[PDB]
Symmetry: D2
Subunit: 331 residues, 4 copies
């Protein structure tokens, strides 16, 4: 308009050329938790939202845009069309059918396959070089699904996996000791949720392992009953869902932590879900959480945790179960 | 005990504590924004619905690894709010269809006669920040019930209205809203006043370049920007059912000024008797200096006669409702 | 270690948000620490001709890595270390000596820039250039000429720190945070800068509308002394501590933030103003500029009084009178 | 006051104030790090050279627009430090060539007999963080002159040594130092102790994979990492003449745990009489829990016989000198 041209003289015709762009697919509670956390950590210069419900999608977009004065992310966009996501560095998948009472993982996954067969090829088309971060449950199997459909190399398809399980473990460990979770170390690996593995040998403060002071740590003979910390981790989502109906804030913060390592090329070590065929005795195409070095090319390296026979067996059983489900999937 | 050796029988007194009352979408957006900005060393949540409260508290605690707020607590018992520097009220009644204004406001008075005295009892020195709508009269109600001096009872007012104005302003100009200046004042919502004489970029008044700016003669109809602001909450509610994120960021911005004693200027709701021709105890949004004692100073905005009449009218409407309230 | 970490990907890292600082004097290291603590870069490169000092500064920054989010800090006298920078900040140059004319001082900076700038352009053809070396406005012209860059990608820090100082002093007078005190100092950085009194305001309330003599000798609040303090600032600080560093470092990192995050905020920085503001020469002067990922894309047009006009024109004449004598 | 109307007679007092004593390169690096981490609502600087002091203050004030610390003050008079939560001591004297270690400490005692009583008069409830070298003995000196309980007198100790270890470890492994764990304890400087048993990534002890880790038979020669840690300051001093940036960031990390009550674990200098077989009043670095009350708890590291003997030898040297100081 004329007033704008009285106020401002334009000296450059510029192109879009997005530079540090993140897409979040799905604007349910998880997706919007991821979105607000990413915004308040200044990780992106452009944020795109995608979902199939157009009213909801646009109203979330607008609500975020109205806070722009208080943010440092200049462009917030949304559309049901995936061209809005073009040139993302990182695309976060939180969409999918949510599990019904009594529904098996096989049935739920199969319900999601038709959804992912639409989303993933669309994401890959408009951002052929992006990293894919899968959050939708069940996380380990859906990361496999996204990997197979995308054709992406394994380093660029990542499941959020046990990142939050380990965060929950450290929160509860810290509450017990009276120390901040940042200084309380412990790793929950393997399958996300009920079959995860607390690696008791690695639980430590300031490099002092608890098991060195308490040889019964994590067993039924343990006088402090640290096995119940892992049980609380396993039961956390059910507990929160019972009180408030869903979880959102912690997974959103967890996912923004992963986004930070990717966008900033930090090469921090995260318990996240990666294709571990060839490692820990696994012989099939399976995604499980191990400590992964996460940076600008996704997962480039893994730490080799020394596992006991019991821990290794729990891992192999998960991989067998996972593979048993996956080979029954109709793509 | 074998791992950690205690050396100090110390007792924990909260130094920079904030309480949010109400854990609906508005209160939780305030909570998450306050946690992300590292403004409190303790966050307390209060609501009457005990399971939903506890579940929100737990969801936040599970993210502690990613935060710098080492204690997050909740309870329907207001003792958990003790020693808050700042208490943010988002609870209240929603209008029933066919219910009248005063009657809705009176129901809010009855609600606040429980909430405010419990807040005052455990944090006698806190600042009170009222976000519940309708904000201007409910700030008055909180002020009356609390007994606090006026500098320590604040309404969020037109803070979000102005941020929306600066967002829409920035879209027309291709400029970041941080560099687009404009002020919406008065009664939050439909009767608010955009002060066209102050709209500027880099100290260049837009009205000086477009003398009809804001009027019906405006060739670019910039009054539609203020209409978009007035309709904003309505459009978003229609689309997604409620608003949460923008009000949360806006309230965290006020909390930052208070907790860090910044003395930035915000368009917030304060008790303006004595100014802009107002004679009664009424709260309207003007530019306020916000710091560790609340609102200590106001910027005197030169208003046109039409603008001044609008402020006076909405002050009359507010006082008409307020003098019928039963405390 | 191969037993501990198993490599899964053969990767060649390309930095995506790299910044270079040229010159590791006090101004350069202040820009460096501020940029690191604002998490603006995924890689920081330092360049300087003093090899020992340069390496000691790099090591000292690297030892703080644990407390930072910038995973790679490198340095060399060789500009290959700067390859693929989004943003290159020049603080190096010559300092005037006893008996040396201004023209000769600037010419020594030209000859220095004739080594630095072509090396910067060799390794980062698409970078934005931010010139901090004094005399700022002339040397931004020198860098632009030598680089062959289009004007949107050569930025001089200009009056950014001057306006920040004005806003600090304004906030001290009023008891308001400088974030809420608005005023613009434009034109030439330093002695000949121009305070645009018409724009000084709080919350959109122009102080001149309340005080018609604002900024004049008849002003009873004597606001002219605020600008005089702005002009004298560097001199007072240099007299007391020997140099200035912290403030310019913070203001450069504020500029770096708008560029790296494509914010399109408005800053009083030095841009090639030929054909604008009544100016006819290829000269750099500070006006309110829209700063983003392509540099300066747009300029706000401040309405100037006749006095303000004449001062900007006079600065343009002064700058051009020097620039036309230079040997590139 | 046509522009601003005052509404409140406030006698403002600082709520989150930090003081830095000494504006040499270490002190100013501490200051800029603390300003940029938004840790304080007021920052005070103190030193004996008035021109240098005022100029550093002015240089910081001129960046206020880019900060969130609304008051920055300085003086040589300690009244400017009143009501500090935390006071950081970086001032002192450097060992001249041919000067005995005992004489150097005593010269620092004499300076501290002026500094510490003035700090304590104006901030009787502060935590004291001693950065001046040699840190371990000077934390003792400040403790004795202040009369403070041990929890409130903290030496920066081995915090930076461990950060350098983790930097060098991360460089060897291709991993960010945040994910590389290792602890350097004891006396800051040539005699520090690297606790090889705690060195790990993701809870995987490197010693479990390499039993010779840190010994002369170590095929990867990790002992050279701790030698680099010990030689670091000397190398950087040789190249640029002093060190500043890293110690500044390290101090601001400790200030963060104090100001925000984080209760993180840091390898810092604390009175450890009663632990590790030590029977005198000496300060050494062990893993401490750091919060709003200073050092409240300590992690009990299992030390091998060699490691226990290094720590006890440092204790003996420390006490040997401390025994001979004139207070």
């Amino acid at each position: 308009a004329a007033l704008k041209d009285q106020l401002i003289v334009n000296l450059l015709k510029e192109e879009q050329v997005p530079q540090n762009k993140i897409t979040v697919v799905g604007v349910g509670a998880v997706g919007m938790a991821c979105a607000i956390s990413i915004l308040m950590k200044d990780l992106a210069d452009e944020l795109a939202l995608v979902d199939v419900i157009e009213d909801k999608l646009k109203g979330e977009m607008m609500d975020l845009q109205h806070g722009s004065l208080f943010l440092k992310t200049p462009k917030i966009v949304s559309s049901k069309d995936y061209s809005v996501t073009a040139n993302s560095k990182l695309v976060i998948i939180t969409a999918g059918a949510r599990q019904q009472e009594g529904e098996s993982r096989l049935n739920l996954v199969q319900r999601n396959v038709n959804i992912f067969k639409f989303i993933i090829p669309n994401v890959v088309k408009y951002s052929p070089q992006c990293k894919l971060l899968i959050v939708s449950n069940p996380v380990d199997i859906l990361t496999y699904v996204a990997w197979k459909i995308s054709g992406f190399p394994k380093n660029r398809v990542i499941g959020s996996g046990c990142n939050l399980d380990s965060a929950r473990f450290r929160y509860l460990m810290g509450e017990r000791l009276g120390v901040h979770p940042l200084s309380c170390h412990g790793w929950v690996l393997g399958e996300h949720g009920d079959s995860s593995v607390p690696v008791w040998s690695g639980v430590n403060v300031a490099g002092v392992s608890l098991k060195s002071l308490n040889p019964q740590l994590g067993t039924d003979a343990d006088k402090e009953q640290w096995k119940d910390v892992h049980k609380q981790v396993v039961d956390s989502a059910y507990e929160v869902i019972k009180l408030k109906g869903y979880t959102s804030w912690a997974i959103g913060l967890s996912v923004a932590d992963l986004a930070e390592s990717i966008m900033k090329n930090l090469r921090r070590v995260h318990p996240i879900s990666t294709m571990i065929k060839g490692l820990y005795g696994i012989k099939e195409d399976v995604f499980l959480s191990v400590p992964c070095i996460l940076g600008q090319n996704g997962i480039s390296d893994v730490v080799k945790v020394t596992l006991t026979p019991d821990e290794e067996a729990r891992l192999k059983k998960s991989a067998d179960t996972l593979w048993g489900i996956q080979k029954e999937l109709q793509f």
